[PDB]
Amino acid sequence: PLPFFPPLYLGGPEITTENCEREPIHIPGSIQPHGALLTADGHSGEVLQMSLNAATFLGQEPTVLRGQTLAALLPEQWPALQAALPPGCPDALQYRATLDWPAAGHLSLTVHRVGELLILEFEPTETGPHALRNAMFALESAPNLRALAEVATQTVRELTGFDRVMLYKFAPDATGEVIAEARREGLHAFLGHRFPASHIPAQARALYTRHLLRLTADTRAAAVPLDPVLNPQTNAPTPLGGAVLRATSPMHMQYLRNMGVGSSLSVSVVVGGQLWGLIACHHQTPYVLPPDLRTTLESLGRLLSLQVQVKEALE
Amino acid sequence: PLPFFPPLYLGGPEITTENCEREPIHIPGSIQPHGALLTADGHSGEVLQMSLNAATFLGQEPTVLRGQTLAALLPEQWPALQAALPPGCPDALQYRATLDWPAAGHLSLTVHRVGELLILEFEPTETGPHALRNAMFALESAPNLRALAEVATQTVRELTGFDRVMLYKFAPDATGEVIAEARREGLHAFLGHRFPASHIPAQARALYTRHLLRLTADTRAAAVPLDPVLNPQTNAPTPLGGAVLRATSPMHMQYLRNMGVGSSLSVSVVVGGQLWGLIACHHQTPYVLPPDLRTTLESLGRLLSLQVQVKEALE
Ligand SMILES: *C/C=C1/C(=C/c2[nH]c(/C=C3[NH+]=C(/C=C4\NC(=O)C(C=C)=C4C)C(C)=C\3CCC(=O)O)c(CCC(=O)O)c2C)NC(=O)[C@H]1C
Numbered sequence: 001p002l003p004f005f006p007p008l009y010l011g012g013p014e015i016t017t018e019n020c021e022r023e024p025i026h027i028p029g030s031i032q033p034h035g036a037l038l039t040a041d042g043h044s045g046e047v048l049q050m051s052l053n054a055a056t057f058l059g060q061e062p063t064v065l066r067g068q069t070l071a072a073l074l075p076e077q078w079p080a081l082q083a084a085l086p087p088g089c090p091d092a093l094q095y096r097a098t099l100d101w102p103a104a105g106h107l108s109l110t111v112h113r114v115g116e117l118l119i120l121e122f123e124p125t126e127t128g129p130h131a132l133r134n135a136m137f138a139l140e141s142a143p144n145l146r147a148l149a150e151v152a153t154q155t156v157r158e159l160t161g162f163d164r165v166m167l168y169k170f171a172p173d174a175t176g177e178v179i180a181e182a183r184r185e186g187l188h189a190f191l192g193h194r195f196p197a198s199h200i201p202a203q204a205r206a207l208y209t210r211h212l213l214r215l216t217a218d219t220r221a222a223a224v225p226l227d228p229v230l231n232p233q234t235n236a237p238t239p240l241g242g243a244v245l246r247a248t249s250p251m252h253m254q255y256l257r258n259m260g261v262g263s264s265l266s267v268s269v270v271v272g273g274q275l276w277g278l279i280a281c282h283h284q285t286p287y288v289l290p291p292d293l294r295t296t297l298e299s300l301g302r303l304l305s306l307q308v309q310v311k312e313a314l315e
Numbered sequence: 316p317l318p319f320f321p322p323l324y325l326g327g328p329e330i331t332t333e334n335c336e337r338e339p340i341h342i343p344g345s346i347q348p349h350g351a352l353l354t355a356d357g358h359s360g361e362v363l364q365m366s367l368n369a370a371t372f373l374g375q376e377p378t379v380l381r382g383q384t385l386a387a388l389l390p391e392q393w394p395a396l397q398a399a400l401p402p403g404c405p406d407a408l409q410y411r412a413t414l415d416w417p418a419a420g421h422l423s424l425t426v427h428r429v430g431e432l433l434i435l436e437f438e439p440t441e442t443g444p445h446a447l448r449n450a451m452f453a454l455e456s457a458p459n460l461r462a463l464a465e466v467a468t469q470t471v472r473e474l475t476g477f478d479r480v481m482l483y484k485f486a487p488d489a490t491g492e493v494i495a496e497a498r499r500e501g502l503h504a505f506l507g508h509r510f511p512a513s514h515i516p517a518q519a520r521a522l523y524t525r526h527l528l529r530l531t532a533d534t535r536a537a538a539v540p541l542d543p544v545l546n547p548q549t550n551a552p553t554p555l556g557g558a559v560l561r562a563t564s565p566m567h568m569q570y571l572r573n574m575g576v577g578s579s580l581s582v583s584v585v586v587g588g589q590l591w592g593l594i595a596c597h598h599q600t601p602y603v604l605p606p607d608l609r610t611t612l613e614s615l616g617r618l619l620s621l622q623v624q625v626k627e628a629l630e
């Protein structure tokens with residue numbers, strides 16, 4: 001991947017189709033507005049950054065949260081959080097808990113660690129695992145790779161109710177082909193369609209080998225900045241590749257709108273450490289898939305990755 | 316597997332260590348007393364058999380339930396149940412729902428189909444899937460088969476709190492070896508111990524390739540008969556291999572008591588359709604693992620089966 005541009009907030013250049021592989025998608029300095037995000041020092045728990053919308057979810061102003069400790073804000077979770085994510089743990093490891101809040105439903109908390117920084121995501125949440133347990137029989141009995149792909153896309157559609165679910169396989173030249181598709185009756189088919197490599201550029205493919213699920217809940221929603229935008233530990237951008245709330249590339253969001261997609265989600269299929277493909281999902285309207293369903297999709301992605309490796313070895 | 320004896324209730328011979336591979340463990344005509352079981356006609360939903368304890372869980376006498384329809388007893392579930400388990404579906408496929416009941420907690424319903432018979436299990440139930448999602452990173456990063464086994468047993472112990480969790484690998488001669496073990500501090504180690512094939516006889520190993528989880532919740536609990544004991548559709552024994560509530564072999568329950576085990580559970584590890592091993596769990600006291608945790612263990616068993624196949628292929 002040819003070197004990243006600075007983000008727009010550090011004076012970087014505008015993105016065009018001539019340089020899109022240089023967009024620093026991992027450090028947008030902003031989040032999707034269906035949740036809130038805090039970052040905190042990994043030893044002290046001092047809150048270092050806050051999404052500007054944090055008052056809507058946490059009930060205190062961003063500027064008042066800044067500098068407070070997670071021991072003060074989350075006294076019941078802090079010791080567990082800190083034990084679960086020790087220094088040097090994988091940046092994909094998550095601590096999850098459910099918090100009570102004044103509004104309807106609960107608040108889901110998801111935390112991961114990058115270097116000395118803890119990144120906390122808060123999202124409102126008002127049958128999946130057992131449905132997945134059941135689907136494993138048909139995934140196992142699938143006779144070959146294409147049959148497995150067909151079962152996988154139908155299974156994902158059943159779990160999620162997404163309008164369209166595709167298995168998008170990368171060729172060695174990074175072009176893609178839709179090798180299986182489950183879709184709502186009425187929808188035009190992408191099955192068999194092939195696409196240039198530019199649609200999922202090299203830096204995206206690299207990120208997707210490390211952090212295996214990403215989404216855009218509402219393809220017209222404006223991003224919410226982090227404040228301060230730079231991590232004070234480093235005076236540098238905050239890596240958000242491990243946060244589902246990370247703001248999506250505006251170039252990709254424009255692609256999705258042009259395609260008539262209101263909500264998008266994909267899960268990586270990783271085989272021998274290489275990005276083999278994506279389970280790629282669309283909805284016609286905005287849709288926040290709940291955290292527990294996302295966890296189910298992650299698990300299915302891992303299972304599918306392994307089955308692909310096993311079915312491919314039959315050849 | 317050399318042919319089954321009739322069960323004791325059809326005049327079959329007593330089991331000894333000279334003939335234990337002939338015990339008809341799949342048709343004990345009885346269940347474990349921590350739940351209730353009904354069987355029903357697969358088209359009409361007519362209740363055909365009832366565990367003698369059914370009044371404790373369902374609030375009507377076994378003899379009064381007999382002949383009533385699932386449309387009458389479970390009006391909210393029957394159409395979904397019937398659609399989920401059509402004639403000829405795999406006998407391992409499950410329909411699951413949660414029912415309200417007068418006592419504390421809920422009643423978990425699990426249904427599967429064998430031939431023209433639906434078998435319904437009812438058990439009281441008052442973090443697992445996400446913990447499994449997390450453990451998949453360490454299972455993937457395990458460098459080889461033994462390391463994977465070590466991670467798997469620790470993971471299962473963390474999910475369940477079982478006193479002992481072993482990976483019990485079968486050799487080609489059906490003898491076993493404990494190749495990984497996670498256990499409570501203080502417990503004597505079985506790591507590296509080898510055991511004759513007789514401890515898990517051929518009919519058991521065969522059943523365990525078809526129905527991948529089984530348990531004994533309380534190794535001193537008396538079984539509860541089914542009434543009538545024979546399925547009226549067939550005038551023959553009711554196959555219970557697909558029911559976790561199935562009564563355990565008394566010979567095995569005696570083995571467990573002799574070993575100081577109060578509760579036992581295992582999950583099959585199946586590779587290329589062959590029984591490779593078991594995740595074998597013990598608790599020192601009785602323990603009913605909740606249905607949702609069992610589902611998580613099934614999912615882990617499938618994942619582990621695939622990882623074993625992939626790690627073994629590195630050789
Ligand atoms: C010049 C840059 C472009 C570009 C950049 C871009 N694309 C992504 C991410 C995705 N693009 C995807 C492509 C498809 N989805 C489809 O449905 C089809 C065809 C039917 C295609 C070809 C997909 C699946 C992704 C992954 C994300 C998702 O699942 O929604 C990114 C990275 C986005 C991010 O994670 O922030 C970027 C920077 N796309 C272009 O088309 C050109 C203009």
Ligand SMILES: *C/C=C1/C(=C/c2[nH]c(/C=C3[NH+]=C(/C=C4\NC(=O)C(C=C)=C4C)C(C)=C\3CCC(=O)O)c(CCC(=O)O)c2C)NC(=O)[C@H]1C
Pocket residue numbers: 331332333334335336338340491505510513514515516519529530531562563564566567570579580581593595596
């Ligand atoms: C003559 C017959 C015998 C016999 C029969 C028998 N055994 C089983 C099932 C199991 N036996 C197991 C063996 C072990 N568990 C351990 O912890 C160790 C060693 C540390 C061993 C060797 C296991 C794991 C099972 C599976 C069930 C479970 O997980 O609890 C059956 C079938 C039981 C059923 O499903 O109804 C039978 C009939 N066992 C003997 O020792 C001899 C006397």
